[PDB]
């Protein structure tokens with residue numbers, strides 16, 4: 150779980166996986182065998198990002214492969230979030246109502262979004278993001294734009310329309326012209 | 339895209355990958371080299387599931403590896419579903435309002451669910467399913483049960499609570515006792 | 528038979544996921560619910576590739592997702608191969624007998640593993656014949672003789688003379704050719720595609 | 722330096738995904754937004770493993786997700802190794818010099834690839850010494866001599882006598898031991914962990 154206990158275990162596995170003893174690995178890093186042994190005893194807590202990049206280099210792998218997963222925040226498979234546990238965040242316009250996330254699925258980023266603008270001309274595109282995205286119009290009408298922001302594709306979405314946006318596809322939302330505001334629920338995954 | 343064009347191409351790749359010529363592969367299947375060549379020309383459309391299992395066996399792989407992906411139903415990254423394109427389905431109680439799906443992410447199964455019962459004693463558990471699951475209480479109160487149906491864990495979820503259910507975790511929903519009915523939006527992914 | 532069983536189980540799983548009962552799927556397919564029940568009861572054996580594609584399509588997924596993995600052909604996690612039992616296959620590129628593939632152990636538990644002793648017959652690097660790269664990553668070892676390897680752009684390749692004991696890695700889709708070193712007659716590779 | 726750059730880029734990506742600005746993250750971490758901007762400007766080099774874990778935790782993900790892949794050490798998709806350049810390492814299990822590992826080519830583009838010529842020094846199958854299985858799948862080839870292989874439950878193992886040219890596959894975590902065939906002195910394996 151802790152960075153240094155995950156790292157200690159993974160480091161020993163990797164080192165062994167490539168047949169190095171403490172001495173060999175130590176030679177490659179400007180440390181003693183006793184120091185490398187210490188990292189493997191959970192004493193790597195102070196290693197810098199740069200040093201970690203070097204350890205990962207000499208063992209022909211990534212920092213990823215030497216550090217633990219995000220962890221387990223689940224009560225027997227479940228995490229719950231109560232309505233007023235959420236934070237409210239800005240545009241830069243949208244207002245974000247962040248719903249339940251979990252380290253057992255870091256991709257899951259579900260939001261309730263209030264869409265403050267109803268002037269499709271003001272649509273602020275994002276350059277497309279890392280996961281796929283399910284969306285559902287909660288209240289009102291959404292004017293959606295996607296693809297190339299130069300020559301976009303557009304759609305008018307009444308209340309209760311659902312839509313999917315593939316990863317890295319640039320997109321933008323606004324309420325339908327002169328309808329004031331709409332509400333989206335978004336599930337990035 | 340079509341089953342037989344995907345299969346034709348994948349079959350040729352696999353056969354070549356394991357160094358077999360048409361003759362060699364044919365010997366293993368009770369066909370002529372000319373017949374195997376035909377499959378590789380898109381003429382495998384009539385092959386049975388059982389025959390496909392055999393082809394996959396002799397090439398030391400799965401039917402999966404020899405057939406195309408689900409396909410692409412996206413208009414430049416996006417698919418949209420209008421409110422009244424959805425089907426309404428039964429319990430066996432819940433009423434399902436199936437939202438937008440896509441072959442580019444077959445796991446995505448988003449639903450609006452009406453929960454018809456408000457007697458937690460009547461909760462019908464499912465044995466847990468294949469994907470992860472995000473849920474959001476749309477209207478009313480949900481009495482949720484999960485884990486072992488013998489000795490379950492339970493939670494009361496007010497309107498606008500969000501929850502995550504890990505894959506294969508058995509779970510059941512009902513409205514809070516004597517509250518009539520509630521609405522969930524579920525996103526299986 | 529295990530194919531029909533795995534399909535039966537994965538058909539039921541997928542149908543339940545999209546919230547369709549026997550009737551809904553059966554209608555979307557122009558079948559009776561009994562037939563679909565039958566399929567889900569191990570009776571899908573005779574369905575065609577084309578019918579399977581239809582089923583996968585209606586279910587918004589792939590035939591692959593509805594079919595079981597390649598099975599387990601291991602004996603407590605191990606499969607062995609004795610030198611006598613190797614499939615031997617020819618490698619002809621023009622009309623020229625270029626390689627002889629001696630096929631090493633393979634297993635349905637790691638389908639992409641394709642190891643080989645490759646007899647490298649030609650020894651004139653000038654007539655080296657490129658593949659167009661292939662799907663797997665590849666580990667290679669000079670087993671006997673000396674090898675003249677070419678890779679990358681066939682017009683202007685990178686090159687290496689590799690003696691007995693040399694080892695190389697070729698990343699997927701990277702095009703490559705081998706002959707024995709000019710005038711040495713023949714050489715041998717262990718190639719491990721994974 | 723490429724570590725700090727990749728972190729900088731992946732930190733910004735992740736922060737934007739969870740909809741936090743510089744201020745929100747900075748506060749959740751007891752830092753100023755300027756420091757977080759600095760991190761996102763390639764200045765994260767000196768952050769500790771522990772600080773990284775905190776950052777990953779607040780961002781509900783893993784350090785791995787915030788750090789770049791192992792780089793590319795290939796020359797147009799190929800890396801070669803000449804027999805002279807092999808790392809040589811000893812394999813001692815009790816006080817006994819059991820194996821000699823000659824390390825073959827490896828690459829950051831397929832970190833799990835670990836090929837070896839293994840010199841098998843012992844030739845008394847009775848004193849065969851098991852590992853506890855390991856992470857990768859493994860392909861093996863009898864390079865020289867004859868091998869006595871044991872696998873599975875060390876109390877009651879499965880076994881194989883394998884002559885020169887035999888090939889085997891060992892699935893991950895399956896425990897296994899090798900010696901040379903009783904009384905033949907020594908043998909050689911090519912082992913390819915992948």
Ligand SMILES: C[C@@H]1O[C@@H]1P(=O)(O)O
Pocket residue numbers: 260262275278282320321322335337
């Ligand atoms: C993530 C929710 O769709 C909005 P964004 O992608 O515009 O932030």
Ligand SMILES: C[C@@H]1O[C@@H]1P(=O)(O)O
Pocket residue numbers: 449451464467471509510511524526
């Ligand atoms: C999928 C939606 O959660 C409900 P179920 O899992 O009870 O069908």
Ligand SMILES: C[C@@H]1O[C@@H]1P(=O)(O)O
Pocket residue numbers: 643645658661703718
């Ligand atoms: C496997 C040996 O490299 C050759 P090929 O990949 O062209 O067959």
Ligand SMILES: C[C@@H]1O[C@@H]1P(=O)(O)O
Pocket residue numbers: 837839852855897912
């Ligand atoms: C790699 C050779 O099999 C032995 P080891 O895995 O025990 O080192």
Ligand SMILES: [Zn+2]
Pocket residue numbers: 278282314320
């Ligand atoms: Zn988005």
Ligand SMILES: [Zn+2]
Pocket residue numbers: 467471503509
């Ligand atoms: Zn569910």
Ligand SMILES: [Zn+2]
Pocket residue numbers: 661665697703718
């Ligand atoms: Zn090759």
Ligand SMILES: [Zn+2]
Pocket residue numbers: 855859891897912
């Ligand atoms: Zn091993």
